[PDB]
Ligand binder design. Structure first.
Ligand SMILES: CC(=O)N[C@@H]1[C@@H](O)[C@H](O)[C@@H](CO)O[C@@H]1O
Ligand SMILES: CC(=O)N[C@@H]1[C@@H](O)[C@H](O)[C@@H](CO)O[C@@H]1O
Lengths: 746, 734
């Protein structure tokens, strides 16, 4: 067992490097001499838009820029003054005074939405303050302005996170401006000649940084891992106007203060900017990779930091001729974002923990996180294989941890053995599942994300859906409403999933008032399709007084919006024993207390049929208030506390399912998997290649005559696997184990 | 110890009726004392209406959504309605009076493209789009009086003849109703009070095919139409109401809906007609030496006893059902009549009066909820209803009633029937204003539920609080600003309702007016989703987030870190909230969240608790760090206060009624208005007791709102204090 492993190294550490490389089977070492003689592939970081304060300080007007939105200021009379910077980090951001503020900025009456006239406001010469006159008392006002980014955001993040205190703040730069651009390509040509020992240029990353703004208290103020805020300049804006035939407003970037969060329903202006900026970016990335290839070296892209405008899931990404993409393995979902990228020769995972004093300190046990991280990646990898694993940081730190070092030895051999046994071919998927949202394929595995791998109270009930699926024995694609309006639903999809809050990219907004969309979905379901809706699926506010989820008729459930309180809701009896809930641990105490307290008897203005006490047993995450069954032919599987959390509904040949929320857990992934088989009328096809125990999952490889079963926990798991022919085999799986077995070839 | 009491009679219980009338101080008897008789103007005459069946009341009904699976589809009309109550009107031209809708698109289906089946109650529709949902809106005869129906179904009267109602908008039936009443007056010479139960139109009460309540609105005008009135409406207003203007997409004009022009128009038109006819009945009663008394319920639609001009009807009295403090105030606060009467609970019926039950429990409990409200707004008369002999079986109950009627009068004698002193002027702001006084947040009378109780509680708390409450409308505020005697404006409810206001919060004139007022010293209390308006501003959902220091994340601003300042556990507002030393400690020790990327920080990792806020408003948060958070558990805000110039805004996410929660609100009130030092005066240390002060009679009292001994210390205005030890629902004076 050797290879597919990238080892970090450091100055004055050649013995241990040699030792570890032997131990872990490393065929590549990453940068940070007697080591260069070891024969390995050599990776070297490259930071195209920073690491040259000597230049940018002589061209400060070519730093990158961002539109920023001030706090709202209440006018208590016909004039108002607006500080521009009271709410931002001055070390990070500076108002751009060089470029005519009347041409490129916007004062706005947020109370009315109206743009204040240019003649009515002046920028103070001596203070970062705007004076407004001729305005309305008791309205709120804001300025939207261009600010130079005078400190690279991620280095800033690392500086503050590590308290580098004294150390010099690295200034970033923007190759949209041609002097700076030339600087960057000369510097890169030069560096290649000065680096013959390097084999892989590890671009970390490219030209534009994802939205990451900090406030006057040195905290994160705004972030979006997909954000295009930090991509502007007067010349880019003006070139945009000429190319697209309309002028973007600053509002098109600040977006009422939302800064175009990917959760926002996508506006045409947004996408145009992505088109514009991404073409500029893509052309220049291809240059870097051509130059790389001409120096005999490979080009590798970090999925992160300055990755904006690359758009790896959009078409043509392959025309870049990038060799590889490497990324942070945070979980299943983030593993899949990497794995699934097409148009590279190979993919690579930077696993956790980062070799750093934060997790490598005396008394802490890094191997727990090591294995847990591997376990979450491994389940995904069986569905979409990455090519290489590796670690990052100070190798000397991890060397002081014997147990960890042995843990890695284990993971490395396992990773290789999964690859050798499988041939790097993805497990067979038993069902075709499509996530449907406004973004589709360009945000594959990127839905519900805000900051990378950091779900929170607001997102985790939907993120749970992707996490569950990332490792699930199904084929997962991402499709858009434009996809559906334009081409219908491809005939191979078994299930369509639509989840999220109302008025988001992930439910779709007012596209649900488009009858053409509603027709396509209804016909497909009726004909045999399956629609799973989570949260407020198919929602459209105000369109129909008495109908919030437009496909309430398909999933059998709607959400009361305080418009329909005069209409009693009659809940049919909950069906607690069902295919879908088959694996939910039963709790005798809870079940008989729920049996004993009965259903509510009908009563005026209150409807009836609602369990007086909760059945529970399933974590559905954040509640959707007052969901109810549209009539009594819907099957209710959970309807606790006066509303619906899980329901199924027959709809001609097809079915729809409602689920209020789905945090990730071994149990909920089992629930979701069951919903998928049940809604697609594929109860029959469920048992083939499955683990009876939900803590484990099964991967079939028909062309290699194989199947494995994996333990997703750090505890022993016994499970019963069922093969296609009906036969079964028992298993006792150790802590994080795996087991292979034959099955007829094809 | 004499009078203000109405007793119910019976057939043969003549001996014990004299004795109860003497023990209770009854000065009136219902069916030598003052005699009441129920009158049912739109029912009890099947002999008449059986021959005039096109003159029963009518209502527009919305069918179920029927999915079309090709270019035609059939819509059954009655599958979802109780056929013993409602019958489709085949007489009046359906293509003129009915509407077929493509719900999926909103479009009215051309009437050329549908027909009514000659033999089934089913509409055939052609030329439709497949995979759309379709409904019919159709006129229907109400052939079974809704309340009588309800009482029949509830008691299982079996095959007892169903009462068929009638609609006096039709002139032949009007004459009949008036003639009959003339005759009836001449035949009841010993009847002193005519207790109209009620008048001409029943509040919306429709039942389903399974004999269950289908639609109800206590304020609802669904049951008030006819081809005749519809055509007349057109001729007076110059436009034709659509069937949609009644079924309202399935909402049937629920009071929670933001009012539409067509809605208020209909209320004016119908209300005109009811009031003149109600005046006539009141004149005829008066001409025959009798009082007219109105039951605030059942067939009360069109009377609008809170709209200007109610007094011009000449009603001598309104009687109403005492369900709780709020419903008491509904009756109490009515101007335009000489006196008011509450019918108390329990009703004298076997469902409470059992073989081994203690109904005196229910009795005191009903009186406690009422008397706290009565102290603020006095009702004139008290009374009960049902079967006196059932009530007469339970001596402990009889001795309870005696005790209550005494108390009830003693309050009257002691206070000249004058409303106690209110220490603050509180106005509730919503789309309806005065005309829905004490009627906000209600669907079915006295039955709050999951969806409403977190706001109903606001009214139930106010109903018995030592403050002056009025109800104002957006139209009031937009036309006349804010009256300068107001200290506090409350606005509460979910987004897109009449109670929050809907898009009126995008009218800069409203924002301006409230803002300026608060800035200069006013106080705005916002409950639930105050001032909410969807999609107007991407970054701002509560238009007055700036005033109260809170907004609700609507999933558009997730890229913006929220920073919750630390909670203030020791504040005037929360002073009477106990906290378990241990719970507090657990919260103190778990601390606050460290800023984390795309997760903000400052949210307590554990909850402080101790306050039932009812239904959560998900993802409320502090707009800045200068807002004072009083409770912000589970990653969001439940209670907050914020200084705004000389004034204050305050957010509460919800407030189910209880004694604690009224105390919490009352403190909110004094605090927001910079009246903290005006608080202690005429106050009870214990939240389970309350204190009314009556300067003019040089008097105050203190009541126990519970069935339990309570010890409270009362602070008077000079700074002195008496200690009370009140027994079960007791009361003391000074
Ligand atoms: C994959 C990626 O771009 N990760 C970045 C990480 O590099 C950065 O340091 C952090 C700062 O909050 O944000 C994101 O996690
Ligand atoms: C005050 C009032 O209108 N009370 C009525 C009651 O008479 C009727 O029987 C009931 C039907 O559910 O509705 C209301 O509670």
């Amino acid at each position: 067992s050797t290879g597919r492993f990238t080892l970090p190294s450091e100055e004055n550490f050649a013995e241990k490097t040699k030792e570890l490389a032997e131990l872990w089977g490393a065929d590549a070492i990453r940068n940070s001499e007697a080591v260069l003689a070891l024969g390995k592939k050599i990776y070297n970081a490259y930071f195209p838009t920073r690491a040259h304060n000597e230049w940018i300080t002589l061209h400060m007007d070519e730093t990158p820029q961002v539109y920023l939105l001030t706090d709202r200021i209440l006018a208590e009379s016909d004039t108002v003054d607006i500080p521009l910077m009271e709410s931002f980090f001055a070390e990070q951001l500076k108002p751009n005074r060089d470029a005519d503020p009347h041409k490129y900025w916007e004062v706005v009456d947020r109370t009315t939405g109206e743009v204040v006239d240019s003649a009515n406001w002046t920028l103070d010469a001596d203070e970062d303050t705007v004076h407004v006159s001729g305005v309305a008392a008791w309205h709120e006002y804001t300025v939207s302005f261009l600010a130079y980014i005078i400190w690279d955001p991620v280095e800033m993040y690392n500086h503050l996170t590590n308290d580098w205190g004294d150390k010099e703040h690295e200034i970033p730069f923007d190759i949209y401006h041609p002097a700076t651009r030339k600087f960057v390509f000369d510097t890169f040509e030069q560096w290649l000649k000065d680096s013959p020992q390097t084999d892989v240029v590890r671009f970390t990353t490219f030209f534009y940084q994802f939205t990451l703004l900090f406030d006057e208290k040195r905290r994160e103020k705004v972030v979006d891992w997909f954000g295009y805020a930090c991509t502007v300049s007067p010349r880019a804006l003006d070139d945009f106007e000429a190319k697209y035939g309309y002028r973007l407003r600053p509002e098109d970037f600040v977006d009422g203060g939302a800064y175009n969060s990917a959760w926002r329903v996508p506006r045409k202006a947004q996408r145009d900017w992505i088109d514009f900026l991404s073409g500029f970016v893509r052309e220049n990335v291809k240059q870097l990779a051509d130059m790389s290839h001409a120096a005999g070296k490979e080009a590798m892209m970090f999925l992160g930091d300055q990755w904006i405008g690359t758009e790896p899931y959009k078409d043509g990404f392959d025309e870049l001729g990038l060799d590889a993409v490497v990324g942070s393995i945070g979980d299943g979902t983030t593993t899949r974002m990497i794995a699934d990228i097409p148009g590279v020769k190979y993919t690579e995972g930077r696993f956790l923990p980062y070799f750093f004093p934060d997790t490598f300190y005396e008394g802490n046990d890094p191997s727990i996180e090591g294995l847990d991280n591997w376990r979450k990646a491994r389940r995904a990898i069986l569905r979409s294989p990455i090519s290489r694993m590796g670690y990052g940081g100070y190798l000397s730190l991890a060397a002081k941890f014997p147990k960890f070092v042995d843990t890695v030895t284990h993971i490395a051999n396992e990773f290789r053995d999964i690859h050798d046994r499988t041939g790097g071919v993805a497990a067979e998927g038993e069902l075709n599942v499509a996530i449907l949202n406004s973004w589709g394929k360009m945000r594959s595995w990127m839905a519900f994300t805000v900051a990378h791998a950091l779900p929170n109270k607001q997102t985790y009930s939907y993120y749970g859906i992707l996490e569950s699926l990332s490792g699930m024995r199904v084929n997962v694609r991402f499709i858009s409403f434009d996809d559906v309006l334009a081409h219908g639903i491809d005939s191979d999809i078994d299930v369509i999933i639509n989840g999220g809050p109302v008025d988001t990219a992930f439910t779709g907004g007012d596209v649900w008032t488009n009858p053409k969309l509603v027709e396509t979905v209804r016909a497909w379901v009726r004909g045999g399709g399956a629609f799973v809706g989570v949260g407020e699926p198919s929602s459209a506010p105000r369109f129909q007084t008495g109908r919030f989820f437009q496909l309430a008729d398909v999933i059998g459930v709607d959400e009361e919006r305080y418009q329909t309180l005069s209409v009693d809701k009659y809940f049919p009896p909950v069906v607690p024993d069902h295919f879908i809930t088959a694996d939910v641990p039963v709790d005798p105490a809870a079940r008989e207390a729920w049996e004993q307290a009965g259903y509510r008897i009908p009563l005026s203005g209150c409807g009836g049929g609602q369990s007086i006490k909760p059945l529970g047993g399933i974590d559905f995450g954040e509640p959707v208030l007052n969901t109810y069954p549209v009539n009594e032919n819907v099957t209710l599987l959970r309807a606790d506390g006066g509303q619906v959390q899980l329901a199924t509904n027959d709809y001609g040949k097809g079915r729809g399912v409602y689920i209020s929320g789905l945090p990730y857990s071994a149990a909920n992934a089992r629930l979701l998997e069951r919903v998928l088989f049940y809604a697609s009328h594929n109860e029959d096809k469920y048992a083939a290649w499955s683990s009876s125990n939900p803590e484990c999952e099964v991967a079939h490889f028909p062309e290699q005559g194989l199947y494995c079963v994996i333990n997703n926990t750090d505890q022993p798991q016994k499970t019963t696997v069922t093969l296609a022919d009906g036969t079964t085999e028992d298993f006792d799986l150790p802590d994080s184990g795996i087991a292979w077995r034959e099955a007829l070839e094809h």
